[PDB]
């Protein structure tokens, strides 16, 4: 039953998937994976082509006769032109925010948080820094009061994340829909009482004349915006810090100023960016890598693998913090490219800049990897600031 090349939820693969990605790229760069019921593309050029062609590779699987479950019809699962009013509304609301004000308040918040954590013997960088920091950032950016971070919140997030892998665990589907419904209730409460500033108040202000109805598709889109904004930067910050501490000489290069944060942050996104897989429905027979991809089949762009493709990046398995050029796919391309990438970069630059003021930072225990093959990150990263 085991796949001869790639088992994304095998614990040995979860510990370090990149050698497996590399062997797959070298052997079958366009690979039919029976368990995933999908082609897997591990090369940068093929992944770019998939993301740039919505008429051929669709996010709306209703077009290949798969119904969209409740909570999931949204900006993420519509193609142009159906997607375009929502996409333009979200772009307009995001661009109306003051990124300079956000950077100022996140810089203060990060310094305050790390000063408190430096008073501890050690701490978990994921739960005690990253999740606190990114929940603050996304709720301030949207303009809403944050949810309580209790046990139920954590279990809903785990259920939602695990449902991204529901093709390999069918029982994960219904808990994931319950988690999205839970966060939809949160979004509806926010929409009923918008605050003075933020993405959500501007969405409400821009809705008249946008071509977007204030309906469940909008609610699902705002949920996904919030949930990605909370989780994906946390996944990245943990991956990035873990890579810096594990790579000989990498942290000292930043401490000494031998490399700048601009190229370093981009190289960390290329090296250990959290999004591993972007799936699309094939709407027309297409040849990729000499393989006959058929209408009605699913293709998956393994962009984590693509970002270590030697055809695109010389010495791709090395963390080269001054890497130039660096055309990584970490924020996607085309009609569904990341709407939060400027906020995410601010979070990364702020966090790394703040950590560099504690040069003695070091691991205080083993990292723990989340058992997720689609969105990759850590559940624990024990740390001391020295």
């Amino acid at each position: 039953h085991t796949d001869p090349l790639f088992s994304p939820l095998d614990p040995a693969v979860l510990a370090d998937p990149y050698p497996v990605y590399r062997r797959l790229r070298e052997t079958h760069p366009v690979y039919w994976h029976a368990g995933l019921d999908s082609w897997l593309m591990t090369r940068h050029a093929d992944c770019t082509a998939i993301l740039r062609d919505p008429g051929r590779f669709s996010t709306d699987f209703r077009k290949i006769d798969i119904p969209t479950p409740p909570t999931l019809l949204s900006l993420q699962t519509l193609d142009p032109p159906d997607q375009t009013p929502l996409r333009h509304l979200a772009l307009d609301a995001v661009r109306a925010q003051d990124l300079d004000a956000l950077r100022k308040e996140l810089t203060l918040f990060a310094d305050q948080l790390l000063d408190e954590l430096a008073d501890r013997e050690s701490f978990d960088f994921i739960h005690d820094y990253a999740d606190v920091f990114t929940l603050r950032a996304i709720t301030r950016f949207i303009g809403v009061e944050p949810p309580e971070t209790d046990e139920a919140f954590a279990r809903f997030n785990d259920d939602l994340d695990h449902s991204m892998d529901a093709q390999l665990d069918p029982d994960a589907e219904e808990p994931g829909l319950r988690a999205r419904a839970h966060f939809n209730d949160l979004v509806r409460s926010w929409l009923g009482d918008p605050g003075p500033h933020g993405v959500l108040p501007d969405v409400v202000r821009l809705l008249p004349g946008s071509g977007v109805e204030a309906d469940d598709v909008l609610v699902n889109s705002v949920r996904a915006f919030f949930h990605a904004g909370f989780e994906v930067p946390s996944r990245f910050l943990g991956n990035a810090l873990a890579a810096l501490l594990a790579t000989p000489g990498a942290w000292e290069q930043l401490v000494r100023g031998d490399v700048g944060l601009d190229t370093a942050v981009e190289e960390l996104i290329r090296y250990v960016g959290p999004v591993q897989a972007l799936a699309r429905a094939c709407l027309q027979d297409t040849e990729l890598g000499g393989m006959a991809v058929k209408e009605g089949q699913v293709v998956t762009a393994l962009i984590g693998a693509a970002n270590r493709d030697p055809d695109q990046f010389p010495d791709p398995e090395t963390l080269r913090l001054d890497r130039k050029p660096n055309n990584h796919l970490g924020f996607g391309r085309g009609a569904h490219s990341c709407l939060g990438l400027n906020v995410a970069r601010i979070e990364a630059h702020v966090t790394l800049g703040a950590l560099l003021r504690h040069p003695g930072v070091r691991s205080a225990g083993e990292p723990v990897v989340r058992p997720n093959g689609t969105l990759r990150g850590l559940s624990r990263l024990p740390l001391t600031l020295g």
Partner: peptide, 5 residues
């Protein structure tokens, strides 16, 4: 694998 929040 579906990247859907």
């Amino acid at each position: 694998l579906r990247y859907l929040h």
